[PDB]
Protein backbone atom coordinates (compact mmCIF):
# COMPACT_ATOMS: atom_id res chain seq x y z
CA UNK A 1 0.00 0.00 0.00
CA UNK A 2 1.08 3.57 -0.76
CA UNK A 3 -0.99 5.71 1.60
CA UNK A 4 0.61 3.65 4.38
CA UNK A 5 3.94 5.43 3.91
CA UNK A 6 2.88 8.63 5.64
CA UNK A 7 2.32 6.87 8.96
CA UNK A 8 5.32 4.63 8.28
CA UNK A 9 7.47 7.75 8.57
CA UNK A 10 5.58 10.42 10.54
CA UNK A 11 4.48 7.86 13.14
CA UNK A 12 6.69 4.76 13.31
CA UNK A 13 9.55 7.16 12.54
CA UNK A 14 10.94 4.81 9.91
CA UNK A 15 13.78 5.70 7.52
CA UNK A 16 12.38 6.27 4.01
CA UNK A 17 15.31 4.33 2.56
CA UNK A 18 13.74 1.23 4.09
CA UNK A 19 10.52 1.41 2.09
CA UNK A 20 9.94 1.29 -1.65
CA UNK A 21 8.75 4.88 -2.17
CA UNK A 22 7.40 3.59 -5.50
CA UNK A 23 4.70 1.12 -4.49
CA UNK A 24 5.01 1.21 -0.71
CA UNK A 25 6.36 -2.28 -0.01
CA UNK A 26 8.92 -2.71 2.75
CA UNK A 27 11.13 -5.15 0.89
CA UNK A 28 13.47 -2.60 -0.71
CA UNK A 29 15.90 -4.06 -3.24
CA UNK A 30 18.08 -0.94 -3.40
CA UNK A 31 17.69 2.85 -3.20
CA UNK A 32 15.76 4.99 -5.66
CA UNK A 33 18.04 6.88 -8.05
CA UNK A 34 16.22 10.20 -8.42
CA UNK A 35 14.65 10.71 -4.99
CA UNK A 36 15.61 9.83 -1.43
CA UNK A 37 13.98 6.54 -0.55
CA UNK A 38 14.25 2.85 -1.39
CA UNK A 39 12.79 0.68 -4.13
CA UNK A 40 11.51 -2.89 -3.99
CA UNK A 41 12.97 -5.40 -6.47
CA UNK A 42 9.82 -5.57 -8.66
CA UNK A 43 9.52 -1.79 -9.00
CA UNK A 44 13.23 -1.60 -9.83
CA UNK A 45 12.82 -3.99 -12.77
CA UNK A 46 10.02 -1.75 -14.00
CA UNK A 47 12.25 1.29 -13.69
CA UNK A 48 15.06 -0.22 -15.75
CA UNK A 49 12.45 -1.27 -18.30
CA UNK A 50 11.36 2.34 -18.86
CA UNK A 51 14.65 4.22 -18.71
CA UNK A 52 14.78 6.21 -21.92
CA UNK A 53 11.38 5.40 -23.35
CA UNK A 54 9.82 8.58 -24.78
CA UNK A 55 6.43 9.64 -26.15
CA UNK A 56 6.00 11.01 -29.67
CA UNK A 57 4.93 14.43 -28.39
CA UNK A 58 8.41 14.52 -26.90
CA UNK A 59 7.85 13.83 -23.20
CA UNK A 60 9.11 11.05 -20.98
CA UNK A 61 6.68 8.15 -21.40
CA UNK A 62 6.31 6.94 -17.78
CA UNK A 63 6.27 8.54 -14.31
CA UNK A 64 9.65 9.75 -13.01
CA UNK A 65 9.16 8.23 -9.55
CA UNK A 66 7.17 5.03 -9.97
CA UNK A 67 6.66 4.53 -13.75
CA UNK A 68 2.85 4.76 -13.95
CA UNK A 69 2.10 5.33 -17.61
CA UNK A 70 -1.05 7.23 -16.64
CA UNK A 71 -1.28 9.88 -13.89
CA UNK A 72 0.94 12.49 -15.58
CA UNK A 73 1.87 15.92 -14.20
CA UNK A 74 4.06 17.64 -16.81
CA UNK A 75 6.98 19.99 -16.06
CA UNK A 76 6.74 23.65 -17.02
CA UNK A 77 10.42 24.08 -17.83
CA UNK A 78 10.85 23.67 -21.63
CA UNK A 79 14.11 21.73 -21.29
CA UNK A 80 12.38 19.18 -19.04
CA UNK A 81 10.62 16.12 -20.41
CA UNK A 82 9.85 14.60 -17.02
CA UNK A 83 6.31 13.89 -15.84
CA UNK A 84 4.85 12.76 -12.55
CA UNK A 85 2.04 10.79 -10.91
CA UNK A 86 -1.06 12.13 -9.29
CA UNK A 87 -0.82 9.42 -6.67
CA UNK A 88 2.96 9.75 -6.48
CA UNK A 89 2.75 13.41 -5.55
CA UNK A 90 0.02 12.97 -2.95
CA UNK A 91 1.48 9.74 -1.62
CA UNK A 92 4.97 11.17 -0.96
CA UNK A 93 4.47 14.94 -0.88
CA UNK A 94 1.24 15.69 0.96
CA UNK A 95 -2.45 14.82 0.43
CA UNK A 96 -4.22 17.22 -1.89
CA UNK A 97 -1.07 18.35 -3.70
CA UNK A 98 -1.69 16.72 -7.08
CA UNK A 99 -4.76 18.90 -7.33
CA UNK A 100 -2.83 22.03 -6.41
CA UNK A 101 -0.15 21.07 -8.95
CA UNK A 102 -2.55 20.20 -11.76
CA UNK A 103 -4.06 23.60 -10.86
CA UNK A 104 -0.99 25.72 -11.63
CA UNK A 105 0.05 27.02 -15.05
CA UNK A 106 3.84 27.00 -14.80
CA UNK A 107 4.94 24.14 -12.58
CA UNK A 108 8.57 23.12 -12.08
CA UNK A 109 9.27 19.46 -11.33
CA UNK A 110 11.16 18.52 -8.18
CA UNK A 111 14.24 17.53 -10.19
CA UNK A 112 14.35 20.97 -11.83
CA UNK A 113 14.58 23.31 -8.83
CA UNK A 114 17.20 22.86 -6.04
CA UNK A 115 14.99 22.29 -2.99
CA UNK A 116 15.28 18.89 -1.32
CA UNK A 117 12.37 19.17 1.13
CA UNK A 118 8.86 18.68 -0.24
CA UNK A 119 6.85 16.71 2.28
CA UNK A 120 8.62 13.35 2.36
CA UNK A 121 9.76 13.67 -1.25
CA UNK A 122 13.43 14.59 -1.51
CA UNK A 123 15.53 14.94 -4.64
CA UNK A 124 18.85 13.14 -4.25
CA UNK A 125 21.86 15.38 -4.80
CA UNK A 126 23.96 14.73 -7.89
CA UNK A 127 21.41 12.28 -9.22
CA UNK A 128 22.19 12.27 -12.90
CA UNK A 129 25.32 10.34 -11.89
CA UNK A 130 23.52 8.16 -9.37
CA UNK A 131 21.00 7.20 -12.08
CA UNK A 132 23.88 5.94 -14.16
CA UNK A 133 25.37 3.92 -11.29
CA UNK A 134 21.91 2.41 -10.99
CA UNK A 135 21.45 1.13 -14.58
CA UNK A 136 25.11 0.14 -14.65
CA UNK A 137 24.67 -1.88 -11.47
CA UNK A 138 21.07 -3.14 -11.64
CA UNK A 139 20.78 -4.04 -15.33
CA UNK A 140 21.61 -7.67 -16.11
CA UNK A 141 23.46 -6.90 -19.32
CA UNK A 142 24.38 -3.20 -19.32
CA UNK A 143 25.27 -1.43 -22.51
CA UNK A 144 27.22 1.69 -23.42
CA UNK A 145 25.61 4.25 -21.09
CA UNK A 146 26.74 7.93 -20.89
CA UNK A 147 25.83 9.92 -17.81
CA UNK A 148 23.07 12.45 -18.49
CA UNK A 149 23.84 16.13 -19.00
CA UNK A 150 22.61 19.09 -16.92
CA UNK A 151 20.51 21.55 -18.89
CA UNK A 152 22.79 24.53 -18.43
CA UNK A 153 25.66 22.44 -19.80
CA UNK A 154 24.10 20.93 -22.90
CA UNK A 155 25.57 22.04 -26.22
CA UNK A 156 24.45 21.83 -29.88
CA UNK A 157 24.69 18.28 -31.21
CA UNK A 158 27.19 17.97 -34.04
CA UNK A 159 26.07 15.58 -36.73
CA UNK A 160 27.60 13.72 -39.66
CA UNK A 161 25.05 11.86 -41.82
CA UNK A 162 26.16 9.55 -44.63
CA UNK A 163 24.20 8.74 -47.77
CA UNK A 164 21.07 10.33 -46.26
CA UNK A 165 20.35 13.81 -44.95
CA UNK A 166 18.85 13.36 -41.51
CA UNK A 167 18.70 17.20 -41.32
CA UNK A 168 14.99 17.86 -41.84
CA UNK A 169 14.21 15.42 -39.01
CA UNK A 170 16.80 16.44 -36.44
CA UNK A 171 15.72 20.00 -37.11
CA UNK A 172 12.07 19.35 -36.40
CA UNK A 173 12.90 17.54 -33.15
CA UNK A 174 14.68 20.72 -32.10
CA UNK A 175 18.17 19.26 -32.12
CA UNK A 176 19.31 21.57 -34.90
CA UNK A 177 18.89 25.34 -34.84
CA UNK A 178 17.06 26.67 -37.89
CA UNK A 179 18.10 30.31 -38.00
CA UNK A 180 21.73 29.21 -38.16
CA UNK A 181 24.24 29.47 -41.00
CA UNK A 182 27.01 27.49 -39.25
CA UNK A 183 25.11 24.23 -39.64
CA UNK A 184 26.22 21.63 -37.13
CA UNK A 185 25.28 18.79 -39.43
CA UNK A 186 27.34 17.71 -42.41
CA UNK A 187 25.70 15.57 -45.08
CA UNK A 188 28.01 13.64 -47.44
CA UNK A 189 27.15 11.08 -50.08
CA UNK A 190 30.13 9.93 -52.08
CA UNK A 191 32.61 9.06 -49.37
CA UNK A 192 34.31 6.74 -51.80
CA UNK A 193 37.51 8.77 -51.50
CA UNK A 194 37.12 10.20 -48.01
CA UNK A 195 39.97 9.79 -45.54
CA UNK A 196 40.52 10.02 -41.79
CA UNK A 197 42.00 13.48 -42.15
CA UNK A 198 38.88 14.50 -44.09
CA UNK A 199 36.54 13.38 -41.34
CA UNK A 200 38.73 14.76 -38.55
CA UNK A 201 38.85 17.87 -40.66
CA UNK A 202 35.06 18.05 -40.96
CA UNK A 203 34.90 19.28 -37.38
CA UNK A 204 34.42 16.81 -34.48
CA UNK A 205 31.22 14.78 -34.22
CA UNK A 206 28.71 13.85 -31.50
CA UNK A 207 26.42 11.63 -33.56
CA UNK A 208 27.28 9.72 -36.73
CA UNK A 209 24.30 8.56 -38.79
CA UNK A 210 24.23 6.39 -41.89
CA UNK A 211 21.62 4.49 -43.88
CA UNK A 212 21.33 2.27 -46.93
CA UNK A 213 19.25 3.85 -49.70
CA UNK A 214 15.64 2.64 -50.07
CA UNK A 215 14.40 0.42 -52.89
CA UNK A 216 14.90 3.20 -55.43
CA UNK A 217 18.15 1.76 -56.81
CA UNK A 218 20.23 4.94 -56.63
CA UNK A 219 23.68 3.51 -57.35
CA UNK A 220 24.98 0.29 -58.85
CA UNK A 221 26.80 0.27 -55.51
CA UNK A 222 25.83 -2.95 -53.70
CA UNK A 223 24.24 -2.35 -50.36
CA UNK A 224 27.14 -3.72 -48.31
CA UNK A 225 29.11 -0.77 -49.67
CA UNK A 226 27.12 1.69 -47.56
CA UNK A 227 27.53 -0.56 -44.53
CA UNK A 228 31.30 -0.95 -44.79
CA UNK A 229 31.87 2.68 -45.66
CA UNK A 230 29.71 3.78 -42.73
CA UNK A 231 31.76 1.39 -40.67
CA UNK A 232 35.08 2.86 -41.90
CA UNK A 233 34.27 6.54 -41.47
CA UNK A 234 32.54 5.79 -38.21
CA UNK A 235 35.92 4.99 -36.77
CA UNK A 236 37.53 8.14 -38.19
CA UNK A 237 34.81 10.19 -36.51
CA UNK A 238 35.39 8.59 -33.10
CA UNK A 239 36.58 10.79 -30.20
CA UNK A 240 40.31 11.02 -29.48
CA UNK A 241 40.97 8.59 -26.60
CA UNK A 242 40.52 10.41 -23.31
CA UNK A 243 37.23 11.83 -24.53
CA UNK A 244 34.59 11.88 -21.79
CA UNK A 245 31.65 13.20 -23.78
CA UNK A 246 28.81 11.12 -25.25
CA UNK A 247 29.40 9.90 -28.79
CA UNK A 248 26.47 8.21 -30.54
CA UNK A 249 25.99 6.37 -33.78
CA UNK A 250 23.20 4.64 -35.65
CA UNK A 251 23.08 2.89 -39.01
CA UNK A 252 19.77 2.18 -40.68
CA UNK A 253 19.13 -0.62 -43.13
CA UNK A 254 16.04 0.22 -45.09
CA UNK A 255 15.15 -3.44 -45.76
CA UNK A 256 17.61 -3.66 -48.61
CA UNK A 257 20.40 -6.08 -47.64
CA UNK A 258 19.93 -9.87 -47.88
CA UNK A 259 20.60 -12.19 -44.96
CA UNK A 260 24.22 -12.88 -45.81
CA UNK A 261 25.07 -9.15 -45.92
CA UNK A 262 22.71 -8.54 -43.01
CA UNK A 263 24.69 -10.94 -40.82
CA UNK A 264 27.99 -9.37 -41.82
CA UNK A 265 26.59 -5.96 -41.02
CA UNK A 266 25.84 -7.32 -37.57
CA UNK A 267 29.33 -8.63 -37.00
CA UNK A 268 30.81 -5.27 -37.94
CA UNK A 269 28.37 -3.04 -36.06
CA UNK A 270 28.62 -5.67 -33.28
CA UNK A 271 24.94 -6.10 -32.36
CA UNK A 272 21.82 -7.84 -33.64
CA UNK A 273 19.49 -5.63 -35.69
CA UNK A 274 16.70 -3.95 -33.79
CA UNK A 275 13.88 -4.18 -36.35
CA UNK A 276 11.20 -1.56 -35.89
CA UNK A 277 8.07 -1.79 -38.06
CA UNK A 278 5.10 0.35 -38.86
CA UNK A 279 1.90 -1.55 -38.19
CA UNK A 280 -1.46 -0.19 -39.27
CA UNK A 281 -4.56 -2.25 -38.64
CA UNK A 282 -2.60 -5.18 -37.30
CA UNK A 283 -0.79 -5.35 -40.65
CA UNK A 284 2.85 -4.68 -41.54
CA UNK A 285 3.03 -1.59 -43.73
CA UNK A 286 6.77 -0.91 -43.56
CA UNK A 287 9.84 -1.73 -41.51
CA UNK A 288 13.51 -0.92 -41.09
CA UNK A 289 16.49 -2.68 -39.52
CA UNK A 290 18.56 -0.61 -37.10
CA UNK A 291 21.87 -0.72 -35.24
CA UNK A 292 22.86 1.94 -32.68
CA UNK A 293 24.36 2.72 -29.30
CA UNK A 294 21.67 5.25 -28.53
CA UNK A 295 19.79 4.63 -25.29
CA UNK A 296 16.74 2.37 -25.49
CA UNK A 297 16.93 1.67 -29.24
CA UNK A 298 16.58 -2.05 -28.47
CA UNK A 299 13.43 -1.58 -26.44
CA UNK A 300 11.78 -0.60 -29.70
CA UNK A 301 12.19 -3.94 -31.37
CA UNK A 302 9.31 -6.06 -32.63
CA UNK A 303 10.34 -9.68 -32.09
CA UNK A 304 6.92 -10.33 -33.61
CA UNK A 305 7.73 -9.24 -37.14
CA UNK A 306 9.13 -12.38 -38.73
CA UNK A 307 11.82 -12.66 -41.33
CA UNK A 308 9.58 -14.14 -43.98
CA UNK A 309 7.02 -11.42 -43.26
CA UNK A 310 9.83 -9.00 -44.01
CA UNK A 311 11.24 -10.77 -47.06
CA UNK A 312 7.70 -10.38 -48.31
CA UNK A 313 7.21 -6.70 -47.44
CA UNK A 314 10.29 -6.32 -49.62
CA UNK A 315 9.13 -8.46 -52.55
CA UNK A 316 5.95 -6.37 -52.81
CA UNK A 317 7.92 -3.16 -52.18
CA UNK A 318 9.94 -3.50 -55.40
CA UNK A 319 7.02 -4.61 -57.55
CA UNK A 320 5.42 -1.16 -57.82
CA UNK A 321 6.10 2.28 -59.32
CA UNK A 322 6.55 4.25 -56.10
CA UNK A 323 9.05 6.88 -54.94
CA UNK A 324 9.59 4.81 -51.79
CA UNK A 325 10.63 8.04 -50.02
CA UNK A 326 12.74 7.06 -47.01
CA UNK A 327 10.75 5.88 -43.88
CA UNK A 328 11.37 8.92 -41.68
CA UNK A 329 8.58 8.66 -39.08
CA UNK A 330 9.99 5.25 -38.15
CA UNK A 331 13.38 6.30 -36.84
CA UNK A 332 12.65 9.96 -36.17
CA UNK A 333 11.84 9.17 -32.53
CA UNK A 334 14.84 7.01 -31.73
CA UNK A 335 16.69 10.29 -31.25
CA UNK A 336 14.47 11.50 -28.41
CA UNK A 337 16.86 10.19 -25.72
CA UNK A 338 19.61 12.50 -27.02
CA UNK A 339 17.38 15.28 -25.78
CA UNK A 340 18.74 14.37 -22.35
CA UNK A 341 22.36 14.79 -23.44
CA UNK A 342 22.35 17.66 -25.95
CA UNK A 343 20.90 21.14 -26.29
CA UNK A 344 17.35 21.64 -27.52
CA UNK A 345 15.68 24.58 -29.24
CA UNK A 346 12.26 24.67 -30.88
CA UNK A 347 11.67 28.27 -29.82
ZN1 LIG B 1 7.83 -1.16 -5.06
ZN1 LIG C 1 4.32 7.79 -10.05
ZN1 LIG D 1 11.47 19.57 -14.64
UniProtKB/Swiss-Prot annotation:
Keyword Oxidoreductase: no
Membrane-spanning segments: none
Top-level taxonomic group: Eukaryota
PROSITE patterns in the record: ADD (PS51533)
Main location: nucleus
UniProt subcellular location: Nucleus
Pfam families referenced in this protein's UniProt entry, alphabetically: ADD_DNMT3 (PF17980), DNMT3_ADD_GATA1-like (PF21255)
Remarks, miscellaneous: Interaction with histone H3 is strongly inhibited by methylation at lysine 4 (H3K4me).
Domain ADD: 8-140
Outcome of substituting residue 228 to A: Loss of binding to DNMT3A
Organism classification: Eukaryota, Metazoa, Chordata, Craniata, Vertebrata
Molecular function terms from GO: enzyme activator activity; enzyme binding; zinc ion binding
Zinc finger (PHD-type) boundaries: 60-116
PANTHER family: DNA (CYTOSINE-5)-METHYLTRANSFERASE 3-LIKE (PTHR23068:SF13), DNA CYTOSINE-5- -METHYLTRANSFERASE 3-RELATED (PTHR23068)
This protein's GO CC annotations: catalytic complex; condensed nuclear chromosome; cytoplasm; cytosol; ESC/E(Z) complex; heterochromatin; nucleus
Tissue: Expressed at low levels in several tissues including testis, ovary, and thymus.
Keyword set, alphabetical order: Differentiation, Metal-binding, Nucleus, Spermatogenesis, Zinc, Zinc-finger
InterPro entries, alphabetized: ADD, DNMT3_ADD_GATA1-like, DNMT3_ADD_PHD, SAM-dependent_MTases_sf, Znf_FYVE_PHD, Znf_RING/FYVE/PHD
Functional description taken from the UniProt entry: Catalytically inactive regulatory factor of DNA methyltransferases that can either promote or inhibit DNA methylation depending on the context. Essential for the function of DNMT3A and DNMT3B: activates DNMT3A and DNMT3B by binding to their catalytic domain. Acts by accelerating the binding of DNA and S-adenosyl-L-methionine (AdoMet) to the methyltransferases and dissociates from the complex after DNA binding to the methyltransferases. Recognizes unmethylated histone H3 lysine 4 (H3K4me0) and induces de novo DNA methylation by recruitment or activation of DNMT3.
GATA-type ZnF: 19-49
Gene for this chain: DNMT3L
Species of origin: Homo sapiens (Human)
The protein's assembly and partners: Homodimer. Heterotetramer composed of 1 DNMT3A homodimer and 2 DNMT3L subunits (DNMT3L-DNMT3A-DNMT3A-DNMT3L). Interacts with histone H3 (via N-terminus); interaction is strongly inhibited by methylation at lysine 4 (H3K4me). Interacts with EZH2; the interaction is direct. Interacts with SPOCD1.
Keyword Nucleus in annotation: yes
Protein name: DNA (cytosine-5)-methyltransferase 3-like
BP-aspect Gene Ontology terms: autosome genomic imprinting; chorionic trophoblast cell differentiation; DNA methylation-dependent constitutive heterochromatin formation; epigenetic programing of female pronucleus; genomic imprinting; male meiosis I; methylation; negative regulation of DNA methylation-dependent heterochromatin formation
Amino acid sequence: GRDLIAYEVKANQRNIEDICICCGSLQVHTQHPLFEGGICAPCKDKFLDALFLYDDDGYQSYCSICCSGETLLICGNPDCTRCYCFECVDSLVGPGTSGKVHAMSNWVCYLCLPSSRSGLLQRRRKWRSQLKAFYDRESENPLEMFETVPVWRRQPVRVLSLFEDIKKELTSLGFLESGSDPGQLKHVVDVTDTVRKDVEEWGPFDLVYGATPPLGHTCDRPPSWYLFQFHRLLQYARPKPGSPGPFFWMFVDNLVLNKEDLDVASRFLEMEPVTIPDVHGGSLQNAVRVWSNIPAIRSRHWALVSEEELSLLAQNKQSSKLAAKWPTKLVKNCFLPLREYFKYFST
